[PDB]
Amino acid sequence: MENVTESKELERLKRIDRMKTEFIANISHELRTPLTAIKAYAETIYNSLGELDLSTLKEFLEVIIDQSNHLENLLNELLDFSRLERKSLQINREKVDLCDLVESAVNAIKEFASSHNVNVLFESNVPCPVEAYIDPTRIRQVLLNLLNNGVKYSKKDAPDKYVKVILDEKDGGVLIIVEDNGIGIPDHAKDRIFEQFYRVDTGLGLAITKEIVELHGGRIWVESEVGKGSRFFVWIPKDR
Amino acid sequence: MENVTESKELERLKRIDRMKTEFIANISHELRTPLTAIKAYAETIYNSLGELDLSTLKEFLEVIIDQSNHLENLLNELLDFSRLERKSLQINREKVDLCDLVESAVNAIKEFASSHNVNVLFESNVPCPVEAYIDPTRIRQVLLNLLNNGVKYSKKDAPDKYVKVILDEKDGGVLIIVEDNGIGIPDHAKDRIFEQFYRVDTGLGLAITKEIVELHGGRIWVESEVGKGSRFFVWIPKDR
Ligand SMILES: Nc1ncnc2c1ncn2[C@@H]1O[C@H](COP(=O)(O)OP(=O)(O)O)[C@@H](O)[C@H]1O
Ligand SMILES: Nc1ncnc2c1ncn2[C@@H]1O[C@H](COP(=O)(O)OP(=O)(O)O)[C@@H](O)[C@H]1O
């Protein structure tokens, strides 16, 4: 005989492992380009030491730095991936004005949004600044995933594609809503979209977004209607 | 009811996954030190550009290079790990003199061997050079794991601890034996030691060693007696 739940789990684990394997394989390769550009603009330099003008320096130095910043972002994706695996991701909270955090995020996503003819808005039902004891870097990361998704899953047939961040306070905490009039999400998938790798049909997406919110002691969920759009809710403690 | 083999597999897969997770976590962290030293000896430099003598250069450049070479070795361990996972590791064969390859390997392990009072020997039952169409870098890696193991598992109570590489030709191919008079290996573990992570009780050990040999079309196995020592055999096609 057999245990069907067990078999489904085993099969589920093997398919997830294939995906983790492909993730690790891809990031391994991407880490190569930078480590290449870094070395190049260096072992070459050292060896031609006795024959170099220092012009072949300020521009070149900028290269190692741009490349290094690229390798750093990649190592961070790998480290985020590892930390999410081990549930060891941490947050470092401080007093932050959520209004500024949101405007900045909206700013960073403006180019991509325009690229798809999607307008990004921000509304606060409470006077700014809206101070919260949170990890600014992490919640910016939260928000950006949310915003990027609002653009990516916008509804082609809508003349007014948009993604709007609504800020507010509730139940003693802060409620952030990222609303879009996109394609929406089917009922069977409203919890599953938060699982690593899941897609209704690198980055860590909604899975790290959920972990960041939960680490703050909050909750995230979605309310959506296919063809109409989705509202992702993020409730976090405000006070601390 | 249930399928016992299935349950054992599931449990086996989860424990292996914990180990892969810890491997990825550790290499992620180690990659940090170099990327740190690299940037440091750089973003600092660029910013103090208008005030720097070029002495704060040749020694410093050496730092970025030593560090880069360290990051490169680490990225290679991660990439080897990934390739072993996907069975996508490749070899690039060429005409190689196995005698020189072995002497070089023995040379590289001499310090560590001395550290444990283990003598390393090399014998060839055929006149050198012993030419084989193989991947030099990979077979050096094979051999070094083998040699390192011979030192690591040497028998404390032996006055003449040693590890000897014996070169020879057989069945139309080349037979390499790495013999030690170490602690030996129990019967139940003679195939299992080649599995990733297995220990009778970073690097990839015997698992990548086996993959490298098999990619050459060869075979590896061990013959051992607890308390007496082990002989690891590597038979590979010679001709190609
Ligand atoms: N605003 C949204 N509208 C519709 N579907 C969404 C939205 N945000 C997320 N999803 C669903 O959740 C899945 C996972 O999202 P995410 O983790 O960000 O990865 P992808 O966005 O798939 O890398 C998406 O593939 C999609 O099916
Ligand atoms: N020469 C040897 N003598 C005794 N045991 C050995 C030898 N080589 C390998 N082994 C066994 O195989 C296991 C796996 O070896 P390896 O993959 O090199 O990892 P460790 O060497 O465990 O990182 C060892 O933990 C040990 O139990």
B200 is in an annotated binding site: yes
Distance CA A89, CA A95 (A): 20
* Contact partners, residue B47, CB within 8 Å, separation at least 6: none
B163 neighbors B178 (Cβ within 8 angstroms):
yes
Which phi and psi (to 5°) does residue B222 adopt?
-130, 150
Query: Ligand 2 centre and the CA of A138: distance in Å?
Result: 42
> CA nearest B176: which of B167, B163, B184?
B167
Report how many domains make up chain A: 2
A229 neighbors A180 (Cβ within 8 angstroms):
yes
Q: Which of A74, A90, A106 is the last residue of a domain?
A: A90
**Do B115 and B181 have their domain in common?**
yes
B44 interaction partners in chain A (CB closer than 8 Å): none
> CA nearest B208: which of B145, B153, B134?
B145
Domain with A82 in it: what CATH number? 1.10.287.130
Distance CA B70, CA A47 (A): 19
Domain with B129 in it: what CATH number? 3.30.565.10
| Strand blocks (E) in chain A | 94-97, 119-124, 131-134, 162-170, 173-180, 219-225, 229-237
DSSP-derived letter for residue B182 is S
The helix/strand/coil state of A221 is strand
Gap from A89 CA to chain B (nearest CA, Å): 12
**Do B70 and B132 have their domain in common?**
no
Structural domain boundaries enclosing A216: 91-240
Q: Does B4 touch chain A (CB under 8 A)?
A: no
Cβ B154 under 6 angstroms from ligand 2 = no
**Do B179 and B208 have their domain in common?**
yes
**Amino acid (1-letter code) at residue A42:** A
Nearest-by-Cβ selection for A10 from B9, B42, B81? B9
Q: Do A68 and B39 touch (CB under 8 A)?
A: yes
Q: Which of B90, B123, B148 is the last residue of a domain?
A: B90
CA A92-A93-A95 angle, 5° bins? 145
**Do B137 and B218 have their domain in common?**
yes
Resolution to 1 decimal, in Å?
Answer: 1.9
**Do B111 and B145 have their domain in common?**
yes
The helix/strand/coil state of A77 is helix
Q: Do A39 and B68 touch (CB under 8 A)?
A: yes
Cβ B230 under 6 angstroms from ligand 2 = yes
> CA nearest B35: which of A127, A99, A79?
A79
Q: Which of B37, B61, B90 is the last residue of a domain?
A: B90
Q: Which residues 10-29 in chain B show a CB within 8 A of chain A?
A: 10, 13-14, 17, 21, 24-25, 28-29
**Do A112 and A167 have their domain in common?**
yes
Looking at the CA of B201, name the nearest ligand.
2
**Do A26 and A113 have their domain in common?**
no
**Do A115 and A230 have their domain in common?**
yes
Q: Does A78 touch chain B (CB under 8 A)?
A: yes
Gap from A219 CA to chain B (nearest CA, Å): 27
Residue owning tokens 């139309």:
B172
The helix/strand/coil state of A239 is coil
Q: Do B46 and A31 touch (CB under 8 A)?
A: no
**Do A114 and A195 have their domain in common?**
yes
Which phi and psi (to 5°) does residue A162 adopt?
-155, 165
**Do A28 and A95 have their domain in common?**
no
Q: Do B42 and A62 touch (CB under 8 A)?
A: no
Which phi and psi (to 5°) does residue A133 adopt?
-85, 95
Burial B112-125 (b: 16+ CB within 10 A, else e): ebeeeebebeeebe
Query: Ligand 2 centre and the CA of B93: distance in Å?
Result: 27
* Kind plus residue range of the DSSP H or E element containing A173: strand A173-180
**Do A76 and A97 have their domain in common?**
no
Query: Ligand 1 centre and the CA of A179: distance in Å?
Result: 13
**Do B70 and B169 have their domain in common?**
no
